[PDB]
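Entry, Tuesday afternoon. Goal for today is a structural model of the target with zinc ion bound, before we commit to ordering more compound. Inputs were pasted exactly as handed over by J.K., no edits. I checked the ligand SMILES twice against the vendor sheet because last time a stereocentre got dropped in transcription.
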Amino acid sequence: NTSGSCKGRCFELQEVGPPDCRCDNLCKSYSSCCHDFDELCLKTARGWECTKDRCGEVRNEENACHCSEDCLSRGDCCTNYQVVCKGESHWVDDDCEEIRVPECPAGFVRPPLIIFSVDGFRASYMKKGSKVMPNIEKLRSCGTHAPYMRPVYPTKTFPNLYTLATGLYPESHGIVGNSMYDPVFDATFHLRGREKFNHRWWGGQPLWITATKQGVRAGTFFWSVSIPHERRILTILQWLSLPDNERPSVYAFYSEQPDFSGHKYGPFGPEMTNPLREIDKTVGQLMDGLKQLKLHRCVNVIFVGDHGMEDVTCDRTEFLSNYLTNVDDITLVPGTLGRIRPKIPNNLKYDPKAIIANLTCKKPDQHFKPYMKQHLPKRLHYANNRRIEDLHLLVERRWHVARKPLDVYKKPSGKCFFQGDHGFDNKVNSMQTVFVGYGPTFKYRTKVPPFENIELYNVMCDLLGLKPAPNNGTHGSLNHLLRTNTFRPTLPEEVSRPNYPGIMGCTCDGSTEERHLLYGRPAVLYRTSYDILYHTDFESGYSEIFLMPLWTSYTISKQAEVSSIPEHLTNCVRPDVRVSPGFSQNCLAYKNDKQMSYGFLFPPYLSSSPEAKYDAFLVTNMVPMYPAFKRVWTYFQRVLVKKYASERNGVNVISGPIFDYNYNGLRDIEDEIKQYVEGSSIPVPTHYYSIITSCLDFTQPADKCDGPLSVSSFILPHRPDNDESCNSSEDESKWVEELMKMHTARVRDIEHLTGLDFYRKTSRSYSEILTLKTYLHTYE
Ligand SMILES: *[C@@H]1O[C@H](CO)[C@@H](O[C@@H]2O[C@H](CO)[C@@H](O[C@@H]3O[C@H](CO)[C@@H](O)[C@H](O[C@H]4O[C@H](CO)[C@@H](O)[C@H](O)[C@@H]4O[C@H]4O[C@H](CO)[C@@H](O)[C@H](O)[C@@H]4O[C@H]4O[C@H](CO)[C@@H](O)[C@H](O)[C@@H]4O)[C@@H]3O)[C@H](O)[C@H]2NC(C)=O)[C@H](O)[C@H]1NC(C)=O
Ligand SMILES: *[C@@H]1O[C@H](CO)[C@@H](O[C@@H]2O[C@H](CO)[C@@H](O)[C@H](O)[C@H]2NC(C)=O)[C@H](O)[C@H]1NC(C)=O
Ligand SMILES: *[B]([O])([O])C1=[C][C]=[C][C]=C1O[C]C1=[C]C(Cl)=[C][C]=[C]1
Ligand SMILES: *[C@@H]1O[C@H](CO)[C@@H](O)[C@H](O)[C@H]1NC(C)=O
Ligand SMILES: [Ca+2]
Ligand SMILES: [Zn+2]
Ligand SMILES: [Zn+2]
């Protein structure tokens, strides 16, 4: 009987229910520790380091850690015991040798994984190097690292740590902010409350559960703040010393630093050296501890942060009161993002249209931009959750938004209480964070491309021999981080087979595949009816259900020439004899719809000859477009495509529509389409994409590329105005490219939104293609 006291139970791995008291390392957070928890489990006497005089001491149970002969056996030596008492070196003082196979004690069933999470560790802190952080720098230089890892939006703690744990976007896992209101629960989630403890908020399947469910024992992934870091490390090491039947295989450590200091001093403060040195010392204690247990060439260690840190002060704050008549009616989640809702839930007089109008381009320098959530860049994946308010403000890096001037407080001396913050758009350089992987399963001395934190969950599953729960990572895209345990991915099977049709109120006046379709036809991964259409200058997959191409593919060489639309063809639209009238668009609809016009997927401007230009005016190359959006699209097609062709030694372009009316990041079924061109069956796209591919070695032309590929893509929102672009009264050269850059995307994003699978026929491995598909060109 072990109830009522923590004798024999300190940091017990199996939690205990009421009315017994607890002795695990969250009992402090639940106010449930036994009366003697501090006395027995949180010993501090004599500190955390052996000194020479303690070597061979008689064991004194009051000590924090031990330097007696029995400590290696008991598993509770101070982490420096063997250095001070047994003539050995610190882990950091050794050179690294490649670990080709795990070197674990007999009886280990798999290499353990330890995740070392650091809060607010900006990628660029790594530049301080070994002067400041020798242990971390050793892991980085000796193991596998990326120059940075991209967090999820919002670039805050709870959404990112839970994304690390689940492989899910915040909209999917449900932790969409550090604070949240759920209108179904009618409850608020916050750091400073009990609501956060209720399982109802927390979706997906976090790693500790995936592990447990598949027979891989987990240590705690949460530490009460009153447990000192030294004790967290000593507890992990004690658990690792347990017998085979009880020892966990996966562990996490969390440090609140360097976030706290970054907020107080700014990311460039000289004060920042101190928390970085302290974190490094803690890393050193872990590695020394592993080394003295002979587990330093056994364990896989991940060093990872949740987000970075930006320079932000009191003085750089925009106030809603300067824009809006009645800020009393609303609640604002403020700071480095904005979410607005009515102060009274359901208030029927809440009108987010008029609020957004009053926030749109009101001052020339304005340091935030309002969006209905469905209009945010699709790369953010920040809309499909009832806890995300309809009205969102994207805040400029280095700025805050608040409701009114008095929400900001500065001391009478002029001093602000903070100089750093985070939360901004996840492509912002300052928000990027760190990734290092070190151990037998990670590669040796390998630098990999920057990747997104949604991908890590699959990799952590791989490292532990687990089947991942369904998530938003792309399994195989990070196989190049690993020496072994790689996941062997499979091409998704094509669901619908194309038809290849021959010749069967609008007026006017082969070897295409080889040149224009460079990576094979995209596969359609849902049940539908569509036709492949060849032309001199382009190829398309034409949908009989949506009456427009799902994709249009074409190649523009570096020397290709732009021409104009002859002014005698300005309104030219030609019937397509390959496609019957019932499955075609018509111009009556566009004439009759006074708000809707049309554009073309393959641009007439890039036609190879006058004769070939006629194909560009086919009804099957036409798509519906608001006049405002044509300003953007025509500029992309007339100007930007050749600029890209010129700079990249030609480009292959695949363009097409996206329909995402319910804003879930997935291709809409027919039923979900909410808008049609007036009096017609012609669906109106929510977005238009383009995927622009060339040869990474740009001395080779795009169509004659022997090695890895280079890609950039976007997903442009199909809006009936250009209110998003404050300078849109000006010529397109002054704003359209900035718009496009904001709506940059991964090929994978387009795949979800279209039900298409690209790059199926290349000379590259499928794992490398998956990496390519997950790439995001950030323009930073
Ligand atoms: C990205 O990847 C995903 C994964 O493949 C893609 O699919 C989407 O994944 C979503 C996440 O699972 C999924 O949402 C879920 O939808 C179902 C049905 O509508 C819904 O019931 C789920 O609801 C919960 O989870 C949310 C947060 O995720 C919670 O806020 C909510 O309260 C529910 O919570 C509970 O169930 C969870 C497990 O699902 C538990 O983890 C959680 O603790 C809680 O369980 C308890 O509380 C209960 C209530 O008291 C109690 O009964 C129970 O016993 C426990 O104590 C969730 O919203 C989408 O449906 C899914 N979409 C599709 C088409 O499959 C997504 O598409 C990918 N995105 C892209 C762009 O590709
Ligand atoms: C095991 O020990 C626990 C802890 O003391 C016992 O539970 C206590 O029972 C007494 C009654 O004899 C109560 O006054 C205490 O409040 C209980 N404490 C707790 C934490 O529950 C329990 O009865 C013991 N069981 C056996 C079989 O010996
Ligand atoms: B994250 O958004 O930085 C975050 C969220 C909730 C609680 C803590 C946290 O960061 C770690 C931390 C920051 C401070 Cl200022 C103090 C202590 C811990
Ligand atoms: C928007 O601005 C106009 C004044 O130009 C005003 O009539 C209206 O109250 C404002 N609405 C809100 C919600 O701020
Ligand atoms: Ca959808
Ligand atoms: Zn954080
Ligand atoms: Zn923070």
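The two ends are 61 Å apart (CA to CA).
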